Symmetry: C4
Subunit: 484 residues, 4 copies
Amino acid sequence: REKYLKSVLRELVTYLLFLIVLCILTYGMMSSNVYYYTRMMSQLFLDTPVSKTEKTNFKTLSSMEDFWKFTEGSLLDGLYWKMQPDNRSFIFYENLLLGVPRIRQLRVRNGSCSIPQDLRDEIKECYDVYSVSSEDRAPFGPRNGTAWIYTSEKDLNGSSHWGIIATYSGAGYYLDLSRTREETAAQVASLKKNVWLDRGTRATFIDFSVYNANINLFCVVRLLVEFPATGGVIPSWQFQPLKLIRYVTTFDFFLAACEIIFCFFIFYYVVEEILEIRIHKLHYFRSFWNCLDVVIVVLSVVAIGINIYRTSNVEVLLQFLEDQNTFPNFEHLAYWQIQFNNIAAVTVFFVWIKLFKFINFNRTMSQLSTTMSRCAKDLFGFAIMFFIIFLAYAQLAYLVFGTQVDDFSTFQECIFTQFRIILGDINFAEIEEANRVLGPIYFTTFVFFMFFILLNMFLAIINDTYSEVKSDLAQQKAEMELSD
Amino acid sequence: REKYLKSVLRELVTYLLFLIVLCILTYGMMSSNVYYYTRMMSQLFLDTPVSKTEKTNFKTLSSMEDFWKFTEGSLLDGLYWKMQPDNRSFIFYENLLLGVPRIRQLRVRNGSCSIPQDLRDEIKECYDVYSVSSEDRAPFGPRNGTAWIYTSEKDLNGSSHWGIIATYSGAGYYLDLSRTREETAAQVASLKKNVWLDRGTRATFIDFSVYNANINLFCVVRLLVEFPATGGVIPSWQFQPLKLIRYVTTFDFFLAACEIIFCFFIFYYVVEEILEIRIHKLHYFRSFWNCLDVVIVVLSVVAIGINIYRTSNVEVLLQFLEDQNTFPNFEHLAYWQIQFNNIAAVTVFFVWIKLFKFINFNRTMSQLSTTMSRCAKDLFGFAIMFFIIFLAYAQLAYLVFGTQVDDFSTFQECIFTQFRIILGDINFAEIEEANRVLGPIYFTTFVFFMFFILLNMFLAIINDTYSEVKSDLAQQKAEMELSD
Amino acid sequence: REKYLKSVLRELVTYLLFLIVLCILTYGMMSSNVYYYTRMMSQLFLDTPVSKTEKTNFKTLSSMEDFWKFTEGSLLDGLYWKMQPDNRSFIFYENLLLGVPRIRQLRVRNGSCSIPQDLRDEIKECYDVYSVSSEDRAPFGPRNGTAWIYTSEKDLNGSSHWGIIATYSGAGYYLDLSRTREETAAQVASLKKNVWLDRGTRATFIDFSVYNANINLFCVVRLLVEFPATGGVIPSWQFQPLKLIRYVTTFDFFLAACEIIFCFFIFYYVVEEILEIRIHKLHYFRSFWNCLDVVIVVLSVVAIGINIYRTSNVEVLLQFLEDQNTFPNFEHLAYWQIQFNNIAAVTVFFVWIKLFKFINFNRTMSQLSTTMSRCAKDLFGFAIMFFIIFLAYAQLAYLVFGTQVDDFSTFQECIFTQFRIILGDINFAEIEEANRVLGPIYFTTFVFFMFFILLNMFLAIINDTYSEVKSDLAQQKAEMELSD
Amino acid sequence: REKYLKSVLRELVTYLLFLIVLCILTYGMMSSNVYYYTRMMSQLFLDTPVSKTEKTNFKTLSSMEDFWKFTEGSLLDGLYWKMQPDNRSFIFYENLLLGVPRIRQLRVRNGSCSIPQDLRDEIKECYDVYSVSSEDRAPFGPRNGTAWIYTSEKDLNGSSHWGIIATYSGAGYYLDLSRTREETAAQVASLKKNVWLDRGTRATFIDFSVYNANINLFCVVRLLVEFPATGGVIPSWQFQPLKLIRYVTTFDFFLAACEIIFCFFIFYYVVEEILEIRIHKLHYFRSFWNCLDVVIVVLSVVAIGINIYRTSNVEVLLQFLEDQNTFPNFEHLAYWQIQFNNIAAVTVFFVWIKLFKFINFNRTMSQLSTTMSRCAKDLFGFAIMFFIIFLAYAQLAYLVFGTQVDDFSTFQECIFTQFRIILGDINFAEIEEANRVLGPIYFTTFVFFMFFILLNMFLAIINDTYSEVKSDLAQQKAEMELSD
Ligand SMILES: *[C@@H]1O[C@H](CO)[C@@H](O)[C@H](O)[C@H]1NC(C)=O
Ligand SMILES: *[C@@H]1O[C@H](CO)[C@@H](O)[C@H](O)[C@H]1NC(C)=O
Ligand SMILES: *[C@@H]1O[C@H](CO)[C@@H](O)[C@H](O)[C@H]1NC(C)=O
Ligand SMILES: *[C@@H]1O[C@H](CO)[C@@H](O)[C@H](O)[C@H]1NC(C)=O
Ligand SMILES: *[C@@H]1O[C@H](CO)[C@@H](O)[C@H](O)[C@H]1NC(C)=O
Ligand SMILES: *[C@@H]1O[C@H](CO)[C@@H](O)[C@H](O)[C@H]1NC(C)=O
Ligand SMILES: *[C@@H]1O[C@H](CO)[C@@H](O)[C@H](O)[C@H]1NC(C)=O
Ligand SMILES: *[C@@H]1O[C@H](CO)[C@@H](O)[C@H](O)[C@H]1NC(C)=O
């Protein structure tokens, strides 16, 4: 009674404070305005029409001509607003354009992959899909300024980006845009005249950044426009907000204090876990609750490391921007900001589920946790079998529909599409348009096996295992009644 | 036999009459035309295009320029219709514009939140997000009439409104529009010329009201246009119909009689409940059916109170409107009308579920109610655990997606989005566009745990508890067969 | 062995032939082209734009002006096609316009419902919602021709139609359009000039018909445009195809022979059922399979009656059309054609489920039918309770959302919306826009009770009852093993 | 121990290698770019607007006039791109138009089906729906060139296509388009002038092909435009990519080696299966795992046969194209390419499920496979009953909605629509617009029976059968405990 209950109360109170501190960190990271901030930026660049007298937008850029219309018209009419009655430009009035934008481009060599000898009469040229081996180093067109000559990824301060069809590395050819509107449009017109953008060009980035004074919040923009070798064009985007500068109001000091307290909490857990390793040399790794604790500790250490080694020291970049009007390179920081934010979120998710360990001081909740534990083995056993059939079905679907329907375009997405089908969300009209024989057969059979038969085995396994724990508890009550 | 069955018959008949009276009140409150009435009003103002030669509408106002186009063109061309061949204006011919509209505006001070010293070269101004502390009291632009000078919430007859991004209180700056069309457009043009609407402006209300003679039904309009500090614009609306005047036809007298009868019914319940409190001093609060009765009684008292203290005496406002052509302020009444309508609905919902108490005079229905009662404890025990995992998942989702996807924009909505995911309704394409690594992982894992494992524990708990009551009833039949 | 098996074989073979004949009738009624026939007609009139230089269509007619644009432009440019190089008009070339269209209108009296005395200064007129009592009999505008004078429902050959907001009876004011295009447009222009269509007008029908020579198929059109008293406009439509003339090819003779055979089959069933009534005077109505048989017999008699008393003798109408160029009134026949088609379908549905009676000559299928029979009582017992909670929830939803969201506009639809919610199809964004406090609460609670708790009681009832039949069969095998 | 485990290890390792080889074949067949290739082609022809100054596209061609606008404008402006500064045309620059397109047409005779004698005054012509009997052989209009004279399916090198409303066989009338743009437009204008396309015309194909040099990938196009006799127009499409030429890079040699290895694997299986037939003469066909093996063997033989007899020898066609500028007829090869791809996919699906046979060397997975085996009989027994009710419901729905809603247009699709309804995806608004009485009743009843009652019997059958295997294993443990 003395050692158990006191040690549980010691552990619980400290864990609850650790949770509260963790929830204060999450509340500080995410301000509730932020959504609307990014939404307005997206509306400006993505959703708006390209020119005044047509339907098309950024989201559905089809041609190279279309992309050229976007860069000349609506890209600029987003970035450069006529000054309110120096000549520094704002967005929406409230947001500040930092320095200038940048148009970057990669390109692939002439004859980078060999053509079959059957069609050597007609075709005298070829360019294959992006890879670091096949990327062009040589000059291009007019030999004039930085815009046309290649520059390596260590020469620039740029990193690799994970694009849609393929990963695009570092940099090659790039123009820095002007701070004024009329000079920019002249530079873009000169690029269009001399055909800077052509067949062989693969990845094109339009990058820049903004800062909102009102809520103290930087934000970067990365308009990637992939050109697949196939022919047409694929777009994407990224709007990452970013609390770059920290210390301003009383709320920030309070957030800073919590982060320091979190550090001491993590330190205490690390001591407590590894003290227990000294006691139990090889008996410690098998218990579930301890394993979960170690994972929370490791994530927290990684979060701290990302915060200290990288995210803190970056103020050097911002100080360089303060003294000039050139391009400011945030892009490398944002990449770590997202990664930090990811890891913190997963930490929170695991921290909340750990709370279970101190729930079972009531009878009913205790029996349910014992049911869940005993069923785990059977469910895991079934889960393998379920996945085998699931992944075969996905492979079938990929082989049939891969060409036609967006849903199953890559194998990565095919799984997730099938998961949506189980719930109740599917683009059936498109499947049926792709293949009228097998398409609906795949769909019927999948529903018939997965939804009526196999998903109910999970249930049957749980069901019976619950009944067996209730009978076990009834016999414990009846056998105790017989003994007394 | 005598005391039980007679007292049940006494209670049942009186309860059934109380239910019928309650259903007559609900039928009287809601006329089946009402939907189409509000639909036509919404179509006029929300859905229509802003100007003649463009795509945009009210629902997707992006810029301040856009809002200005709406107020000058389609707002007025909704309100003011060319008289059919005094000069009083109608809507659709059948509806009557009451008096005039009102354009209200709030605004925040210059330099209400401090700027960081790193960017003190470029930025010389700032305005933070709405709060009562930071709201501007001082004058503005031309010092001319009521439109530009501040007025407090007790000086005006206006209340606080619960807006989208933040709660907007009382009033500040406001113009009353003209009764004719051509004077209004001149006043709106003069506002646009002198920049009455600028950076720093937060909440803007366009209010007015209409009355339909044909079905005797007033209706208010509240076009709120929020300006978040971020930069752009967010719209909303509210179309509340309102049976203001009552006594006209034989149907209204019948409705009035029912409301009076309902009053005596409630009075009788109150006596019956509190007479039972005198009998059972501390044994009464634990039984479910009695607790439900007390809650129905409290709601009914609150409904009566809202009807008498406020909703009835408001005819003073309507009488003031009858003698003039100025702005009529319905807005304060409507707020209570909705609250009444809410509470009445919840009363009805609880009243219907109370009917259960007099269902169990058949064997099968009795066993099911006994199953539901015994399972309640286990289900409640599980419900806590289910919610812990659910709310952790929501917290994870909020941390990942909060910036990108509309669905999880606020924590309040994040829960409800997850509930939709379980059923079969989700915007998957948007999640995947926000975060390709973790986004679909969150979705898979959530489906895997919640939909295949955890939701089936509810079922398993019910299932086994039903089987145990059936075995208990079989042994009661078999043990009675052995005794006889 | 002799009496049972022979009598089962006698019954089965005759029933299978009756089923095959019934499936031949259904195959004959529905030709697989028919869908595309109606689809093209709908595209022409509903989906197309009103004028050349605007967005709006028939489906979203908002104003009276809009309706006037439709009748003058796209209505006529659908009906009248420039003759291919008599002057008889076609649709798509392949379809034939029969005679002419008709524009019918109803109207309500001046001051049909009394106005409150508070607003007697401004409002000097009123018109209430459609009813037969309040419908106007008197003349109107210019006293000229049939178009402006009222005519009763027995004077015309027209019936009542079940409209959307209210049932519209017979007729009142109507113009028959011309056979040529240029005369029609002059008549429509003259109506628009003198304001034939005004405030007080309620229901407006644009009726006509077409005949396709190519597949031998008539089709009627009923463009109803309701004007609710509220102010705006509501549209609907109806495109009923119709095999009017029968005897042409060998397929029709074969269909006719099957219908005659079906008649003798029904006759034989009637004798067989009522012979069994003579045997078992009051022991016959309780068994399920016999009850189902009687219902199939009654429906078949009703189907035959509708076929003979009405649908056959109508050729008189078609013969009158053959001799002239006036309006042909199909409308009364179509009403019975749909009713016949409904009843036949329900007959087929019941006939197929009757097949169960001759399935149970295998052991496994027999046990399942015995499980389904024993569970019926409990499920029925639960079904009542389930519906009580369901209908309370619907009543709550109706009281909250009735004004705002289309989904719950009428109580009839509210039920069906809730059924969709359970499956996985809901317009959540609209509910949340209607009421942010209670709206999502209604949705959460409904999902929590209905989807996690109550729908699984059905399952639990079945589950346990199946297990009890399996134990009963195991003891029958074990007790038979002990006896032998 | 020696014979079992060694023979299992022999079988397992060889099967795993066979699986890996099979997965290498699938990875080789489907390149991850392919989706985007077909997507860009579809965007060009389907989604784009017809003319510059209107809304309509290919997907929603309504009229013959509309089709004529497509062929004259956007068809050509897709195919023919202005040469970059011989005169050979490209698509997107990166893709190559092969030779030329082809416009093919079928037509039906005058008076092919007899008209009723009641309407012999007005109608003097008729054309019925496509069939080989009724197809026109005779000449047409100007007797000039190949475009107007009929040619049979054995005279041409063309096959039958499975269209939407009806199967269209071989060929009749066809024009080969020019290699240049300006000659094509003159030929299309001459067709439009002399009314080559008229009433009576049924199927129209616009065929051509492209080749991408960059990724070595041919692709065919088949723009079918069906004219139903009803009146209007129905479109469809088909974009089949095709790896025609093989041997180029090291990856292809590796793929070729794997295909040869697969051949020897299949050969070994065939010997192993039929060696076992020699041993067990009539005891072999009843076991499940052997039956599955035979089916995988048969599919593989069919896949090999399709690869050798047809898909390999087709290079003759490509060699004929290399020497000329005429039409190249790929169409016959593509048909087999899809069929091969189908069969391979189904082979993969079955191969993956075969893996189960070597899973059961752990206790938990073994019990689940024994549960699944014993339940199979009951589930199969229930499945029949379930389908009877399901197919009756479908028949009911078809009879009601067949005319109105797209969903249930054909009986083939009606089944699949009902399957979607169970999951949570349904167009409810359309059903309700088709029939307000019975429409929602069908939907309620279907949900009530199928979703709450019948789908849970599957579950109940599994549930109890799992519990019975767990009790059987518990008694095997307890009886073994008693014996020891
Ligand atoms: C591209 O490569 C081909 C084949 O090697 C060659 O004939 C041609 O001259 C090259 N063109 C350019 C512009 O480099
Ligand atoms: C090269 O760049 C200069 C400016 O540095 C510009 O004036 C000139 O037009 C460019 N050369 C050519 C050939 O266009
Ligand atoms: C706004 O505040 C800043 C900083 O205090 C000040 O320099 C400026 O004069 C103010 N402007 C106005 C218009 O009040
Ligand atoms: C002030 O208001 C008056 C009308 O009361 C108006 O005539 C005048 O234009 C306004 N003053 C200025 C400076 O615009
Ligand atoms: C309509 O009724 C009102 C009230 O009875 C009356 O004053 C008016 O003259 C009537 N007008 C017409 C056109 O009948
Ligand atoms: C009455 O109808 C006649 C044709 O019958 C027409 O000429 C005349 O215009 C109509 N009367 C008036 C006043 O318009
Ligand atoms: C079509 O057939 C009808 C009926 O046999 C005949 O009168 C007519 O001359 C035919 N027309 C043509 C163009 O063949
Ligand atoms: C027949 O075809 C020739 C070309 O071969 C063309 O010149 C002529 O216009 C055509 N005949 C008629 C009558 O159009």
